[PDB]
Symmetry: C2
Subunit: 345 residues, 2 copies
Amino acid sequence: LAFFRNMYDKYRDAFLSHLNEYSLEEEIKEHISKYYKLLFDYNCLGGKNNRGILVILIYEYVKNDINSSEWEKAACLAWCIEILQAAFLVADDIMDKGEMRRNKYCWYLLKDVETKNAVNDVLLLYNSIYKLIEIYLRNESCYVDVIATFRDATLKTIIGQHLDTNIFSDKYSDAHREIDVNNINPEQPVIDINMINFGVYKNIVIHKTAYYSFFLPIVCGMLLAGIAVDNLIYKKIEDISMLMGEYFQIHDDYLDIFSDIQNNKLTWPLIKTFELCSEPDKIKIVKNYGKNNLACKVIDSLYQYKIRKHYESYEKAQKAKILSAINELHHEGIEYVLKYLLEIL
Amino acid sequence: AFFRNMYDKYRDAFLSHLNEYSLEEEIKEHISKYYKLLFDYNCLGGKNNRGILVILIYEYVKNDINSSEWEKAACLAWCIEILQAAFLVADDIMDKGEMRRNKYCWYLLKDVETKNAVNDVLLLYNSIYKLIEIYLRNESCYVDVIATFRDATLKTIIGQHLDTNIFSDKYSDAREIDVNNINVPEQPVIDINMINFGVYKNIVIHKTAYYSFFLPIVCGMLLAGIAVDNLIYKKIEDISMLMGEYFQIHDDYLDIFVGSDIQNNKLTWPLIKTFELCSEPDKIKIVKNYGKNNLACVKVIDSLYEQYKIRKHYESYEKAQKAKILSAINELHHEGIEYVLKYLLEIL
């Protein structure tokens, strides 16, 4: 863990050195190094690093001691998921028109950066991952499996982000109406009652968060430690990641309200309200939800149906469900790490 | 024509991958409709010069080709056209474009907006690696093919970054980036110290040469069996740099002969050539009129391009650069590749 935080500079510098190998004039090399050193520092640091620490701990409790060479490969993957998290946060802040991230200005808002640089910076941060995995793991037998884990988890995350963005959009509500390529007119957003259910929510939440925040770090630690791809434990870990991803997102929905409502987002409190509330309360929800004004707050006042109390009842049930799955892994090491992660989160 | 017929096979193979995700049937219907359009709207309508270059390089290094081998070649060829589609979607968001291939830019569509378009660039980009996996995971060249895509993309991103910020205040004096300014916008101004051919070549080689020339040729060569450590790859890289510079200078020339490079404050070949041969008072005119979203400002630059005979200077450059490319092609010592590169140089 201590080594993981300390090794940050090494991975950032190993990538910056690859850019410094390019055929460019010395003055231009200096300019890109100063910009890209800040792109990595401003967006990769200041975080809790739970995804990164998960790789370290999984690798440590699977391994059967660990030298500096093996730890360098484990810490590389741990920092690659932190880079992936940074690439997703920069992209998410552009998309959801964010104002603050890790208690400071969103990267894309900076006048030396702007939307034009931030879009290009998401692809840079994303591609740096595969360059870093090549630098430190290209000769490991697990190399192709590791890069496929990053690629497949990213694809599922992109689909999860798409669904989160367009679940209440006109193309999803008016299913029979094909997309009009001639219409270039900020389309007024409204809530869709057909999508306000727990089934649709799980679909989004698992794809948007579970694969890159839970499945990818655990699989990274397991692949590097030598657990064969065909082993039964990987599917068990996939199902646990889904349960944890759902648990983590419902907690994050609970922490954002009691910009979620303002951005017309499908949240666990919104679904729970609709499940217990009657028809006049439903009309009120449709009328207020998805507006940038503080008066439209009626939704916050309705959240009346004791949603905060319902969450405490959900959290108890969900934790027991995750523990039930963990207890059947038949691996003491992974079981200790996952139980530890479930508390300290 | 044979390559354009293969399109559906690769688009559907990736759409089928997304369809195997654990999602509700109605959710699967919506994403398949959106993503079929994401691919169709942005991957078709192009000249496909990058894709055809894979096919011809593969065909002439191989010297007949069976359907299974050509299925692998056409996959890589379509992957570069998907990479082109991803870069054009992103560039239009970045440069705030209006039209691409005679139709509205993807990010401007009511059912898309900037939010979806940003996410769609990452999807199109990652679809390339899923397609390479589906058709080449068991090939010996697999890892080298995916490293080639990754490295050509990394060089394209750096090139696009330089193209975007070469004249920006953070680079005008080497100082520290302002992490506190989110309100006072930067006034777009030219940096005469960056107006030179050496800086231009750095931008253009990274922005265009690697993904438009090096990547397609290396794809055809790797799949045909020329191992990554072969000395001929550095020769291909040098030729790709010359061809990339040659074609971007032509693109810069075409933008003036619509075209927004002047109003967008871009470092172009006409600007460098004008700055090289113009008078000291005309350099003052350039500084005052270049990169301004005003018609009268653009018209002063346009008149300077006519006054300083940029058409004649391009025609003279084209003849000298063509001779330089042919000379590099002749020192390749591979008849099949030489033929393709000589053919593509005339046809493109």
